[PDB]
Design a protein around this ligand. Structure first.
Ligand SMILES: CC(C)(COP(=O)(O)OP(=O)(O)OC[C@H]1O[C@@H](n2cnc3c(N)ncnc32)[C@H](O)[C@@H]1OP(=O)(O)O)[C@@H](O)C(=O)NCCC(=O)NCCS
Ligand SMILES: CC(C)(COP(=O)(O)OP(=O)(O)OC[C@H]1O[C@@H](n2cnc3c(N)ncnc32)[C@H](O)[C@@H]1OP(=O)(O)O)[C@@H](O)C(=O)NCCC(=O)NCCS
Ligand SMILES: Nc1ncnc2c1ncn2[C@@H]1O[C@H](COP(=O)(O)OP(=O)(O)CP(=O)(O)O)[C@@H](O)[C@H]1O
Ligand SMILES: Nc1ncnc2c1ncn2[C@@H]1O[C@H](COP(=O)(O)OP(=O)(O)CP(=O)(O)O)[C@@H](O)[C@H]1O
Ligand SMILES: Nc1ncnc2c1ncn2[C@@H]1O[C@H](COP(=O)(O)OP(=O)(O)CP(=O)(O)O)[C@@H](O)[C@H]1O
Ligand SMILES: Nc1ncnc2c1ncn2[C@@H]1O[C@H](COP(=O)(O)OP(=O)(O)CP(=O)(O)O)[C@@H](O)[C@H]1O
Ligand SMILES: [Mg+2]
Ligand SMILES: [Mg+2]
Ligand SMILES: [Mg+2]
Ligand SMILES: [Mg+2]
Ligand SMILES: [Mg+2]
Lengths: 228, 463, 461, 213
């Protein structure tokens, strides 16, 4: 819902939970991996079938910054039973590695096959305000810092030029004989990201990371929205 | 709003002038008279009855005339007193020379200064500025140099010490000024307001801005205005402080890698602004932008008597994303009428070291007249066969006879005689430089501006 | 050994003529004009006297052992002269003549070298404008009559640009020890010359305009240039930096690797400073010529204006140099005359109202402080000051100091500042009309310090 | 002498070395390589240790992965035997290299400087980022040490995202030795060590390519 930012702010929250961020992003027409928040093993299985296999499970705790490190993430679950295994394994994993940690729930989300990992950012600058960022995403975002910036709202020129300027742009036009990815989808995502910035003053920072680009369309795998 | 009466006032009041000449107020008054201001000048001083042979009043309100501008050179303790007086006198603009405000911590006083000024419906320039100059109105309201060369360049500096020094430096580099404006603390009036004025000013054709930074929430407006301006007039910005602190370590990757520096660069790109990393670059580009029209196409020709200089040029152009194509066959044939067969036509067109002065005239002329040539960079290496001044007059004559306006830049390398020749050319408003790289960089600025303008046009394209 | 080339007792000028406008005659006039003390033997078939000197028709007719023969005759006549010089015992042939390999005639150039070697003599060029050596008052070129004396050695593969730059050194106050044109590089090349300038105590800096080196000569170039770099800075202006179209090779290595990227690496391994522009090359040369290398990274910037200080900092950062906090001793020492609202974050801003005297005191304080390794002084012309006054202050402060620390100066302003900069440069103090150029010059000093460090490590046993 | 591999290749008009030959030749210079051997497959599989990798060795090996002539991560005799017969329709056994930092080490002949060494992050995206460095051989320890710190991706080698830092000294030694191969062997035109997996301790050349002239 568009008002999710409001509810978060009134609850003294400085950020949105992954599933909330994804709902909010989706309501602006940016494609996202279908996600649900399970609060029981049974709800998990149900949501797993409602989403379709294979699926991914993530713990939702405030005291767990790096989930993978505590074994709070299970990837590529293909069967109901495999899902139940993972559901319990994550819970017990978190309790052992971080007992104090409170549990909010388990996130079930569609599995995203491999592809060009991109990042789409949104930052509020004191001078220029809503600003959009683009570049190679994934885990190695900060390593190359191969990025571009544009002040919102973005024209088609702005979005198109900020894509061609990054060095990694070569990946998007077919590299190693690879099939070129959907650039128009990316442009649309960038323009819409800009709109989110302009219309939502309470957003300080936003991270669409990773954003998998395929030959046809794109998908936001993970999102992070920092409020102010 | 409108700043016509700021740059073209009928009456100006210099508050802070004194019998003591060493005082800054007195320096401003002297510059005002020496530079030849046609309007009325009203020295303001408590005790002084006459200053520089002008009737001196103790207060602006005591002046029997509609004062448009008040230059204020009194201690920060006394500025507010003067602001109230200017208010009841109906002054439109307060040019506050005084220091000791936001820059030193006292932002409280600065905001107060602006509020009162706004209460009387009058704007504030500064504070912490060295004043401003406007040549078309013979107005020099600064304590900088007495004079500048007249021209179409407007220079807006956020820095005072460097601003005033550069004011003198424009003379050395033969840059013709339309206006010098110190904006200092940018309490009220800023670059946006000044950009609006210079957009309309038919006397100004190029704008150069030394920018430390802009006020929060002002950036969007800066882009909106600057992009519009950029379509007609080139804007060069010297961004002060362009070295990132690095590693922000925020609550997100975007927050952490995004830096204000990189955002300013993007804002400048979107505004069709050219960003200079150095004063020398800024001045080199300004000169070429002030004296040349933008190239209509990519058919740039380089003409050299030395292969070595030609390669330096090619490397420099390439660094700026400019690649030279084969010259048109019409031009090649036209040049082969006097050039030896062992000359090169790969572009740069090498006319060989033994080329006499006459070939520089013929080559330049052939190029300029050729309808398939959009731009021309002429490189010369001093040899005993030639005289620098001979080559210089050849180039000038060729430009006259061409009877058109195609962008030209000149690079000359050599001793004292070449130095004299470069000055000669520049004094005739022909962009000449003492090295091939600088000449090619200047030409690259013309193309950079063309590309900048094209960027804005595309983004404003009616879908 | 090229000692006989740069310090010859006797030199012949083949191709001189009654006609002054001819190149040989220009060379002869420069040889006399510049003040060569050795014997000069004009060589011409008919002429009996030239420039008031006994002219012979052949080198072998000269009653004296000639060390060097400058040859200014058409290509078709060059070989004959070579044979004559051979029979005369000449050690070096400086072939001005064009029309060899550079225009496709590989055969003639090859033969030229062969005969020259047959007599056991070396060849400079062909296709050069000559060479100059100030310590011997030797100007065997047809370039300008004179150059300023100093410790810089300039080697140019390009003729037109080489001669032009030779004149340009005067305008930029660069003191030359030697100018050498190498042209077609048929025999003697940059390697050989580097070997000589390595030992020559008259040369402290070496500048090279390089278009390229001969195949199978690069390893030798690195070996020599690294060793030279241990003691003397080498600046290179690489002509041809623009990468050509990527080759489609049989490996990732062949597909990625480009000649440009390899040249940059070769220069890195040699401890060579690569200049992208003539301007940069001259600025850096000047600073390297007149200053010792900094011993540490404690670099102080001293300015009367914050704006200039920011431009300095930005430029230093682009060259991987970051300013640290200045030593407390220096801060207090300076606080004795500056206002309290001054800055000490480095750049030490002594504020715009600083008069001339403060530049002497600040400069002196910094230079004597044992925790300061280098000083860049920036000045923005204000009515409070005179550029010349500031200049004299800096000069005096340096004299009083131990002259053991590098200094660069950046001054911004009008005609008076221009005069002040010229004044400082004429006293061998690296001064520039912008803060960016002064800071780039200082960065060149640190770049070479790091370059020498690199070489010292790589050659470390 | 390892030179006999080069000589035999040349006389057979061969302009390149076979993967196993290249690995033997590289290993004889002190560069670590995944041990190789030439039903026969299974026997060597047990002699090398599991898991293993099998690649067909045919006269025309243009792009194996595309032809399905290679089977990865074989852990059991039975699982190995599947591929040995199965790939054919679409006898060289190779050690399996666990995941790690993929690097490239190249060697090329420049007209000016001659034997030149290349380094940088390898894998599939080598030429894309082109994050590489060059040094003319022979390489000093300084040369090798500096050309590593120069590449943008160097950060991967010092512990990134809590990842464990890799053995930098091993990489340096490999680079110096690579340079020596270039200087001493005139018949080698190009060489490609790609990928070279760098682990917390030591490195291993997974695949090698030696172009003769
Ligand atoms: C503004 C400034 C220059 C004034 O310093 P100053 O000249 O020493 O000031 P004074 O104390 O002499 O007072 C100014 C003069 O105006 C007079 N004056 C004071 N208040 C006045 C008032 N309200 N109305 C009229 N005259 C007034 C004073 O009597 C004095 O003149 P005097 O010789 O008759 O006594 C100083 O405070 C300052 O800001 N200096 C820094 C300048 C600077 O760097 N600016 C930015 C450039 S980048
Ligand atoms: C070498 C070159 C400069 C000579 O030009 P030139 O002076 O017109 O040639 P000339 O035929 O007139 O010969 C010069 C003189 O040498 C004399 N000469 C000829 N052969 C001679 C010999 N064997 N011994 C001595 N003198 C000889 C000629 O008689 C003539 O003298 P003169 O005026 O008394 O008749 C010319 O061939 C050339 O290459 N020019 C350009 C070179 C260049 O650009 N160099 C590189 C600069 S980067
Ligand atoms: N929908 C999905 N499809 C496929 N793989 C997924 C996935 N969601 C997560 N993963 C995998 O699980 C890993 C762990 O996910 P997680 O979100 O916890 O961390 P991360 O690697 O994305 C950095 P950050 O925690 O800051 O987002 C990811 O790195 C990715 O490899
Ligand atoms: N920092 C200190 O704080 C005060 C603010 O000066 P700041 O550097 O911000 O502007 P400024 O008025 O000095 C610009 P400039 O000196 O270039 O004209 C000064 O006293 C400075 O030395
Ligand atoms: N190409 C042609 O080949 C000849 C050699 O040109 P090149 O540039 O290689 O040497 P050069 O001696 O002219 C350099 P410079 O002019 O800088 O001295 C010239 O006639 C040129 O026009
Ligand atoms: N021993 C091994 N251990 C782990 N992964 C291996 C491996 N051998 C091969 N691979 C993986 O399998 C992929 C396909 O193998 P292969 O070497 O045939 O193709 P390639 O991508 O290297 C083309 P080329 O051989 O021409 O460089 C490799 O890119 C690598 O990711
Ligand atoms: Mg994630
Ligand atoms: Mg030439
Ligand atoms: Mg003698
Ligand atoms: Mg200041
Ligand atoms: Mg492989």
């Amino acid at each position: 819902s568009r008002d999710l930012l409001l509810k978060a702010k009134e609850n003294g929250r400085k950020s949105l939970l992954e599933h909330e961020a994804k709902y909010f992003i989706s309501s602006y027409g940016i494609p996202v991996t279908n996600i649900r928040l399970a609060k029981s093993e049974e709800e998990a299985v149900n949501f797993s079938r409602e989403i379709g296999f294979p699926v991914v499970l993530k713990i939702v705790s405030p005291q767990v910054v790096h989930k993978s490190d505590v074994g709070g993430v299970k990837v590529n679950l293909r069967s109901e039973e495999e899902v139940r295994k993972a559901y319990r394994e994550i819970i017990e994993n978190v309790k052992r590695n971080v007992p104090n940690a409170e549990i909010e729930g388990i996130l079930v989300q569609e599995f995203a096959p491999p592809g060009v990992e991109l990042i789409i950012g949104l930052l509020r600058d004191p001078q220029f305000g809503p600003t959009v960022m683009f570049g190679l995403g994934g885990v190695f975002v900060e390593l190359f810092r191969d990025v571009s910036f544009r002040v919102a709202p973005l024209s088609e020129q702005d979005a198109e030029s900020m894509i061609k300027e990054v060095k990694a742009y070569k990946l998007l036009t077919g590299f190693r004989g690879m099939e070129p990815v959907d650039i128009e989808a990316i442009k649309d995502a960038l323009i819409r990201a800009g709109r989110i910035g302009v219309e939502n003053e309470e957003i300080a920072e936003m991270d669409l990371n990773p954003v998998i680009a395929y030959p046809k369309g794109i998908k936001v795998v993970d999102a992070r929205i920092i409020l102010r | 709003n409108d700043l016509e009466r700021l740059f073209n006032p009928s009456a100006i009041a210099v508050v802070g002038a004194s019998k003591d000449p060493s005082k800054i107020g007195s320096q401003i008054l002297r510059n005002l008279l020496s530079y030849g201001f046609k309007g009325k000048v009203y020295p303001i001083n408590p005790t002084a009855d006459e200053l520089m042979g002008l009737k001196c009043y103790p207060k602006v309100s005591d002046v029997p005339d509609k004062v448009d501008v008040a230059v204020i050179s009194v201690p920060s303790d006394k500025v507010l007193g003067v602001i109230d007086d200017c208010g009841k006198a109906g002054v439109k603009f307060a040019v506050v020379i005084t220091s000791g405000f936001k820059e030193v911590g006292n932002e409280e006083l600065e905001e107060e200064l602006v509020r009162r000024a706004h209460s009387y419906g009058m704007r504030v320039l500064g504070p912490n500025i060295f004043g401003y100059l406007y040549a078309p109105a013979r107005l020099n309201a600064t304590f900088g140099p007495k004079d500048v060369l007249s021209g179409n360049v407007a220079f807006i500096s956020q820095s005072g010490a460097l601003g005033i020094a550069l004011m003198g430096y424009t003379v050395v580099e033969n840059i013709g000024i339309s206006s010098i404006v110190s904006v200092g603390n940018k309490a009220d009036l800023d670059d946006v307001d000044l950009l609006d004025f210079f957009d309309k000013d038919p006397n100004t054709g190029v704008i150069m801005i030394y920018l430390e930074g802009i006020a929060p929430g002002r950036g969007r407006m800066f882009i909106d205005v600057a992009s519009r301006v950029s379509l007609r007039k080139p804007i060069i910005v010297i961004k002060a402080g362009r070295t990132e602190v690095g590693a922000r370590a925020a609550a997100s990757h975007t927050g952490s890698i995004a830096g204000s520096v990189a955002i300013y660069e993007s804002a400048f790109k979107q505004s069709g602004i050219l960003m200079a990393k150095s004063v020398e670059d800024a001045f080199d580009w300004t000169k070429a932008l002030s004296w040349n029209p933008i190239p209509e196409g990519e058919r740039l020709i380089v003409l050299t008597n030395g292969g070595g200089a030609g390669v330096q040029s090619t490397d420099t152009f390439a660094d700026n994303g400019i690649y030279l194509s084969k010259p048109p066959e019409s031009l090649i044939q036209e040049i082969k009428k006097f050039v030896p067969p062992f000359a090169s036509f790969a572009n740069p067109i090498d006319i060989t070291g033994m080329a006499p002065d006459d070939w520089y005239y013929m080559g330049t002329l052939a190029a300029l007249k050729n309808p398939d040539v959009d731009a021309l960079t002429v490189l010369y290496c001093q040899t005993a066969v030639t005289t620098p001044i001979g080559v210089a007059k050849g180039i000038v004559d060729a430009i006259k006879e061409a009877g058109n306006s195609k962008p030209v830049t000149v690079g000359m390398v050599g001793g004292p005689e070449v130095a004299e020749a470069v000055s000669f050319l520049n004094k005739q408003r022909i962009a000449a430089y003492p090295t091939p790289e600088r000449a090619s960089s200047a030409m690259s600025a013309l193309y950079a501006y063309a590309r900048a303008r094209s960027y804005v046009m595309k983004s404003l394209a009616v879908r």
